[PDB]
Structure 1
Amino acid sequence: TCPFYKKIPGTGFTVDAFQYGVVEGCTAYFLTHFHSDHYAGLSKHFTFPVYCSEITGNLLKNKLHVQEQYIHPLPLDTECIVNGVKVVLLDANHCPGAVMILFYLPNGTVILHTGDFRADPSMERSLLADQKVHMLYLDTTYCSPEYTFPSQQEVIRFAINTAFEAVTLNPHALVVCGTYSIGKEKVFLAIADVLGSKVGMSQEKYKTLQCLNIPEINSLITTDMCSSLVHLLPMMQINFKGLQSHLKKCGGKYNQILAFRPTGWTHSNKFTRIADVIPQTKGNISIYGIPYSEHSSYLEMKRFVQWLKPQKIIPTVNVGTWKSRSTMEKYFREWKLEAGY
């Protein structure tokens, strides 16, 4: 049954709770972003209102075939009223169309649900600055001090230089980028831009990207694999067997694949730096795993929470074990101690 951490008290609202059936008491279902563990159970047969960003609305309509009459897109950074309750959507710095939700309760309580987010100093100058927040429903994916990773910009710089060098040395080398959901488009689009290419992909992935309000997107992407020296593939196909096969499909037009797997965290981040990474090479194919995160590092998360000063924190990730829960609660007490709220 629907967990408490997906319910907004003193409203008829749930958040990312589509896989429980009809939740008793729910008049409006919010969807923070289009990732499968969060929309799980939405379909063309869903008959209750869905509140979400314009981009997430494009994806529900065009990918899941949800009927238009149930989709309520809201603009960002705008005071909106939903079934009598003031709400605001804020950019979550996660994947395209991902939002955080501010709920202003009739009683005067203010609630922030982060969805999935990568906390950033810039959030300290949004509409969150303008009043007290009592409760925080927090993306705790990497809530442990060992999770350090570099800035997105650093990782993108590394990827652009590596690709450029390899292709300049061998103009018949192909770049491949793995994907499985929306998110991490900056990795492949930055690589393509530096190489003066469009990105080649399947028709299904092409449609997906057409939903994202990316400016000039038609000048950036393509289905024509032949006219394209950055390609996208399923992450499931980013391995030697899967790459070889794909190299065989290109019709003797490339003699070398440089591929990137954008992974969240791996235990090689507790030792090695970004400058000091290496690939896994079997022949003319080489696969790099790069630590491109769309969730908060430990330190990013800690700074955000210390700034916001919430009275209560409810974790939304890593909640299924007692050890995880207990460990998160300890970090939250230390943060409040070190800062004095």
Structure 2
Amino acid sequence: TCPFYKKIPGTGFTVDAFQYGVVEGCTAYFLTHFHSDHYAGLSKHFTFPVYCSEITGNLLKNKLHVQEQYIHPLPLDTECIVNGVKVVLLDANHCPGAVMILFYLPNGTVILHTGDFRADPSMERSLLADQKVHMLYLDTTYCSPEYTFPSQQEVIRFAINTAFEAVTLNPHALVVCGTYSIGKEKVFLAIADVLGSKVGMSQEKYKTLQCLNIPEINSLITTDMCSSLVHLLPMMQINFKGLQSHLKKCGGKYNQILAFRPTGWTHSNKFTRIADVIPQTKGNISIYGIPYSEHSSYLEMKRFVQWLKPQKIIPTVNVGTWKSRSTMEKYFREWKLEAGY
């Protein structure tokens, strides 16, 4: 049954609740972003109103074949009325088209649902600055102090520098980047830009990227693998057997692979700096795991929450175990005592 942390009290609304059938009392289903754990259940047979960003709506129409008449895209940073209730969508700094949702309840309560987000000080100058928020539905994916990772900019500099050095040493090296969902497009786009190449990929992945409103995209990506020296493959194929196999397919054009796996966190993070990251190598194949995250680190999360000063926090991630829940509630209390709210 639909969990309470997916329902918005005082409304007919749910958030990211498409796998429970017809939710009793729901007049409008919101979708924060196009990741499978959140859209699970949507298809061309869905006949209730879905509210989302323009980009999410492009993906629902083209990838899932949801019919147009049920897709209700909203502009960002704009006050809109849905079924009698004021709402605003804000950029969540997650994957393309990902939003946070502000609900202004008829009784005066203000609720922020973060969806999935990577908290940033730029959010402290959005429409959140303009009123008090009482209840926070929080993406707690990395809510423990061990979770440190570098800025996205530090990680992309590492990747660009590594790829440019390798391919300038060996012009017959191929760069491969793993993917299994939208998000993290900067990794492969920044590497292709430094090398003067388009990114090559499957027809299914090309179609997905063509839904994302990325500027100048026709100039950056392609389905002609033979003309490209950056290839995208499924994440599952980023291992020595998979990569050896792909190298065979390229008809002797290449004699080395340098591959990237953009993991979120890996416990190499508690000891090692980005400057110090090294690959796993076998023969003429090297694999780098790079800590590119689209979720808040512990410290980014804590700064956002201590700024916002909500009256009540409802976690949306790691809620299935008592140990996790109790850990998270302890940190919430520390933060509140340290800041004084």
- TM-score bin, normalised by smaller chain: over 0.9
TM-score by length of 1: 1.00
TM-score by length of 2: 1.00
Helix, strand or coil: the match of 2:272?
A: coil
Cα distance in 1 between the residues matched to 2:219 and 2:328: 45
Q: How far does residue 9 in structure 1 lie from its aligned partner after superposition? A: 0.3
CA offsets 1:235-269 (integer angstroms, 9 cap, x no match): 01111111011101111101100000000001100
How many residue pairs match? The answer is 341
Cα distance in 2 between the residues matched to 1:77 and 1:220: 29
Q: How far does residue 309 in structure 1 lie from its aligned partner after superposition? A: 0.3
Helix, strand or coil: the match of 2:281?
A: strand
Task: State the Cα RMSD in Å.
Answer: 0.3
- Unaligned residue ranges in structure 1 (runs of 5+): none
Q: How far does residue 25 in structure 1 lie from its aligned partner after superposition? A: 0.2
Helix, strand or coil: the match of 1:51?
A: strand
CA offsets 1:86-136 (integer angstroms, 9 cap, x no match): 000000000000000000000000000000000000000000000000000
Cα distance in 2 between the residues matched to 1:191 and 1:257: 14
Cα distance in 2 between the residues matched to 1:75 and 1:244: 45
Q: How far does residue 64 in structure 1 lie from its aligned partner after superposition? A: 0.3
Q: How far does residue 302 in structure 1 lie from its aligned partner after superposition? A: 0.1
1:203 matched to which residue of 2? 203
Identical pairs, percent:
100
Cα distance in 2 between the residues matched to 1:267 and 1:122: 28
Q: How far does residue 5 in structure 1 lie from its aligned partner after superposition? A: 0.1
Cα distance in 1 between the residues matched to 2:201 and 2:323: 42
Q: How far does residue 221 in structure 1 lie from its aligned partner after superposition? A: 0.3
CA offsets 1:30-71 (integer angstroms, 9 cap, x no match): 000000000001111111010000000000000000011100
Cα distance in 1 between the residues matched to 2:229 and 2:165: 14
Q: How far does residue 13 in structure 1 lie from its aligned partner after superposition? A: 0.2
Cα distance in 2 between the residues matched to 1:64 and 1:332: 38
1:312 matched to which residue of 2? 312
Helix, strand or coil: the match of 1:275?
A: helix
2:235 matched to which residue of 1? 235
CA offsets 1:123-164 (integer angstroms, 9 cap, x no match): 000000000000000000000000000000000000000000
- Unaligned residue ranges in structure 2 (runs of 5+): none
Structure 1 residue ranges, 4+ long, deviating more than 2 angstroms after superposition: none
CA offsets 1:280-337 (integer angstroms, 9 cap, x no match): 1110011000000000000000000000000000000000000000010000000000
Q: How far does residue 185 in structure 1 lie from its aligned partner after superposition? A: 0.1
1:109 aligns with 2:109: yes
Helix, strand or coil: the match of 1:153?
A: helix
CA offsets 1:154-179 (integer angstroms, 9 cap, x no match): 00000000000000000000000000
Cα distance in 2 between the residues matched to 1:251 and 1:60: 37
1:46-85 pair list within 5 angstroms: 46-85=46-85
Cα distance in 1 between the residues matched to 2:212 and 2:98: 11
